[PDB]
């Protein structure tokens with residue numbers, strides 16, 4: 341679990357969105373596993389606007405943060421799950437690091453701010469849904 345709170349927006353994994361997120365929907369994209377909903381309170385998270393390929397992510401299944409080197413956002417084949425059929429997920433960044441299903445939503449950050457959230461994993465890999473291209477989160 342986990343979300344990004346920036347301005348009047350809440351960014352979560354689309355497969356973990358609640359009834360309230362869908363009732364306050366701003367934008368969603370199944371191909372990216374992202375959903376954004378509106379909030380009444382102001383969020384103070386900062387979104388990175390950079391091309392960093394290193395950062396630190398939070399791993400809830402270890403209660404620890406880990407440093408990572410990750411690939412540029414790209415289209416990656418993801419196996420079928422109870423939430424989606426087998427498909428290419430876009431804007432996904434892979435890295436070597438521990439992750440379990442409940443780790444989805446953990447933030448990846450670089451020195452410039454929030455880069456994305458955990459969205460896939462397995463066998464010593466961790467994949468992050470990028471949010472740096474969503475310029476409207478601030479403007």
Ligand SMILES: NC(=O)[C@H]1CCCN(C(=O)C(F)(F)c2cnsc2Cl)C1
Pocket residue numbers: 355373418421423424429439440441442443444458459460461462463
């Ligand atoms: N973005 C997706 O399609 C997710 C949906 C939930 C299931 N997906 C996963 O990768 C996983 F949860 F099974 C997993 C396994 N080990 S670490 C993680 Cl994260 C794909």
Ligand SMILES: [Zn+2]
Pocket residue numbers: 388389390391392450451452453
């Ligand atoms: Zn950066």
